[PDB]
Amino acid sequence: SGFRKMAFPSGKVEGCMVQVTCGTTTLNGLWLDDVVYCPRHVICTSEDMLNPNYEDLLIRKSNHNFLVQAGNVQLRVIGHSMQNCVLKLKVDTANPKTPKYKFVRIQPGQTFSVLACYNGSPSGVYQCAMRPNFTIKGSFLNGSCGSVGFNIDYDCVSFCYMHHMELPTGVHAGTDLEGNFYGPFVDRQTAQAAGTDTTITVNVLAWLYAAVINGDRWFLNRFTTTLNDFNLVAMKYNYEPLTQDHVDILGPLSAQTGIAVLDMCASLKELLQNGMNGRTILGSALLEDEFTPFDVVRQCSGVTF
Amino acid sequence: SGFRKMAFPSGKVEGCMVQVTCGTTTLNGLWLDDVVYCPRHVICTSEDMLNPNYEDLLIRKSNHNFLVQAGNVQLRVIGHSMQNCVLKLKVDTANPKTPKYKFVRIQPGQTFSVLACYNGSPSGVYQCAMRPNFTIKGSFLNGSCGSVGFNIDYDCVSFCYMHHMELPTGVHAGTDLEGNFYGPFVDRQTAQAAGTDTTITVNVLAWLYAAVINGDRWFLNRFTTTLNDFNLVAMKYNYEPLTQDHVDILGPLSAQTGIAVLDMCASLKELLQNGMNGRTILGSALLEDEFTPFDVVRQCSGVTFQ
Numbered sequence: 218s219g220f221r222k223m224a225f226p227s228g229k230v231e232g233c234m235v236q237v238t239c240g241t242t243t244l245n246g247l248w249l250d251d252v253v254y255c256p257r258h259v260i261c262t263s264e265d266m267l268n269p270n271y272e273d274l275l276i277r278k279s280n281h282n283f284l285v286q287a288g289n290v291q292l293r294v295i296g297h298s299m300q301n302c303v304l305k306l307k308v309d310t311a312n313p314k315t316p317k318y319k320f321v322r323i324q325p326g327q328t329f330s331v332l333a334c335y336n337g338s339p340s341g342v343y344q345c346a347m348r349p350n351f352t353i354k355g356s357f358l359n360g361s362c363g364s365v366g367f368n369i370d371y372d373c374v375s376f377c378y379m380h381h382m383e384l385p386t387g388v389h390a391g392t393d394l395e396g397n398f399y400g401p402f403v404d405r406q407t408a409q410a411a412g413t414d415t416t417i418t419v420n421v422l423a424w425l426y427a428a429v430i431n432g433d434r435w436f437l438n439r440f441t442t443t444l445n446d447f448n449l450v451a452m453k454y455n456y457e458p459l460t461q462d463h464v465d466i467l468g469p470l471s472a473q474t475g476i477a478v479l480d481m482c483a484s485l486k487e488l489l490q491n492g493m494n495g496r497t498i499l500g501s502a503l504l505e506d507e508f509t510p511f512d513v514v515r516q517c518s519g520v521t522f
Numbered sequence: 523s524g525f526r527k528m529a530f531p532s533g534k535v536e537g538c539m540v541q542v543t544c545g546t547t548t549l550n551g552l553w554l555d556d557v558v559y560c561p562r563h564v565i566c567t568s569e570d571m572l573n574p575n576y577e578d579l580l581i582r583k584s585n586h587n588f589l590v591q592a593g594n595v596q597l598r599v600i601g602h603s604m605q606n607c608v609l610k611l612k613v614d615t616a617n618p619k620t621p622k623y624k625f626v627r628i629q630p631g632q633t634f635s636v637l638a639c640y641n642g643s644p645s646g647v648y649q650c651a652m653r654p655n656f657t658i659k660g661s662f663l664n665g666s667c668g669s670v671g672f673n674i675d676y677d678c679v680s681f682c683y684m685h686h687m688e689l690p691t692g693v694h695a696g697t698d699l700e701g702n703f704y705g706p707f708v709d710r711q712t713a714q715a716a717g718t719d720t721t722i723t724v725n726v727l728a729w730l731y732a733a734v735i736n737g738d739r740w741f742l743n744r745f746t747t748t749l750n751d752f753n754l755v756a757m758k759y760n761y762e763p764l765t766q767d768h769v770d771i772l773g774p775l776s777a778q779t780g781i782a783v784l785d786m787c788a789s790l791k792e793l794l795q796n797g798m799n800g801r802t803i804l805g806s807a808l809l810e811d812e813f814t815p816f817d818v819v820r821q822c823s824g825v826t827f828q
């Protein structure tokens with residue numbers, strides 16, 4: 218019993234975190250094999266950030282301008298190249314702690330663990346979701362750039378996020394490990410804002426199933442709904458549209474609890490229209506949307522890594 | 523910016539998790555140096571659990587009755603002893619991944635990270651608090667026994683909890699790494715129940731200071747309170763009494779925000795009376811009590827968003 222916002226064990230990623238320094242700027246890097254990946258903005262001064270020409274800033278740098286520190290050991294940079302918004306520093310030593318890994322680009326609504334780092338040293342791990350507006354509500358301070366997001370599938374770490382910046386509302390923006398931003402953001406100090414966010418409907422439904430599995434059923438009702446009538450309600454409450462794919466993905470949870478997906482949608486419709494009436498679900502007075510259907514199945518079955 | 527329920531990076535603890543098997547029972551063990559620590563109930567059957575005589579069950583065991591598996595490697599047990607509710611299995615190999623560590627017994631209100639494990643394999647990491655009723659609201663399934671709680675301040679792992687059992691309300695009970703249970707619990711299947719739980723007042727105050735540091739002040743008011751009047755109101759909402767130690771502990775956060783501890787207490791009193799009126803504090807519609815003053819200072823900026 219119990220249901221917690223659970224992150225993947227971070228050990229496989231901790232063994233990849235390094236400190237990258239270029240001039241006065243210090244941030245985090247991910248050392249996999251003989252390459253250190255980090256935000257390309259490590260080569261910018263505060264003035265350069267206003268309007269950077271990264272290829273031009275980079276051409277003025279040599280390998281020795283990049284100081285890479287792995288624990289108390291200095292790695293020597295033997296090459297450098299840029300791929301989108303990530304700088305790839307070729308080093309002379311392959312990381313002996315390199316896990317089995319892949320670079321994957323995730324979709325909004327998908328969750329991942331973040332290993333927050335400062336000066337190449339891991340400070341904490343937390344779970345978050347890629348919001349529909351492509352931001353993450355992370356917890357990051359100055360120096361956290363280069364911290365990464367990941368999932369683990371069996372023994373393979375799938376790196377999906379690298380931290381680049383904080384937006385004016387305190388939410389965060391970053392890229393996949395190929396340097397492509399999630400969202401309409403750029404790595405420059407200019408007017409940028411998170412668009413209006415929405416609630417990840419399939420995740421709220423998954424968490425309602427988790428609540429039922431954990432013995433919380435007060436919100437269940439005798440009613441069902443059509444997918445179109447539910448979607449009319451979702452649009453009204455700034456909830457993401459629910460698709461037939463979402464319904465299919467919730468099939469296993471629907472079988473385990475005996476509550477049809479559209480039957481759980483009728484419960485959600487009622488919660489949106491009336492509130493919780495002083496009650497809580499899994500210790501929360503808000504409808505939680507940062508657990509996917511897979512996260513719920515994994516936590517309610519004890520999958521190991 | 524942002525405020526998350528943040529766990530310590532679990533790598534240092536992952537390298538210590540092993541699987542311990544005694545007969546038909548399999549659970550997790552913590553391998554530090556040449557010793558594997560695990561719940562003594564690994565030597566019990568379901569039948570034994572009503573009134574087990576651990577000394578009598580243990581005397582019937584030899585070293586080779588304990589199967590310890592570290593990854594795909596079997597460790598050889600060369601000794602065993604019981605210390606309170608923990609079994610200590612001496613093995614022939616010192617764990618090469620043993621971090622710098624200490625065993626610390628925590629007080630209610632303290633937080634820690636839990637690395638939930640099954641069959642000696644880590645499954646997930648989450649942040650927990652020792653409830654005032656000495657239980658933890660964990661996420662644990664059968665096979666999770668032996669999973670540990672810890673803090674990692676200054677590269678040293680302070681192990682503070684080892685999971686032993688789930689109570690009828692779905693909450694969890696365990697011991698420190700010396701095998702002393704937290705709370706009035708025993709490693710017996712008996713009519714045991716968590717006492718009435720309360721809210722960790724000093725932690726709610728800490729999290730209100732975190733909200734002020736991060737830029738939110740909507741809940742502040744022009745009032746103050748005496749410590750005694752605060753406790754008289756707070757106890758009516760099942761909040762733990764706030765002591766002078768808690769007021770002293772909140773000193774640094776009070777200095778950083780410029781809000782006196784008793785002025786933050788007045789805000790808390792008003793929040794208990796009014797609720798949030800559709801508003802949230804750090805993304806929550808409930809008053810959060812699983813962040814200590816130390817956790818807030820660790821996570822939050824040293825510069826308040828004025």
Ligand SMILES: NC(=O)N1CC[C@@H](C(=O)Nc2cncc3ccccc23)c2cc(Cl)ccc21
Nearest residue numbers: 258266357358359361381382383404405406523
């Ligand atoms: N506005 C500006 O010039 N900057 C700031 C530095 C960095 C930036 O957002 N880092 C930060 C990341 N996460 C948390 C922080 C919490 C406080 C401060 C910075 C934080 C950044 C990066 C890019 Cl790609 C663009 C702009 C900027």
Ligand SMILES: NC(=O)N1CC[C@@H](C(=O)Nc2cncc3ccccc23)c2cc(Cl)ccc21
Nearest residue numbers: 218563571662663664666686687688709710711
């Ligand atoms: N009542 C009883 O016979 N048992 C059950 C087994 C074990 C026990 O609590 N394990 C479990 C631990 N954590 C989560 C679980 C979630 C579902 C099931 C078990 C779980 C246990 C241990 C002690 Cl010290 C005393 C009694 C018992």
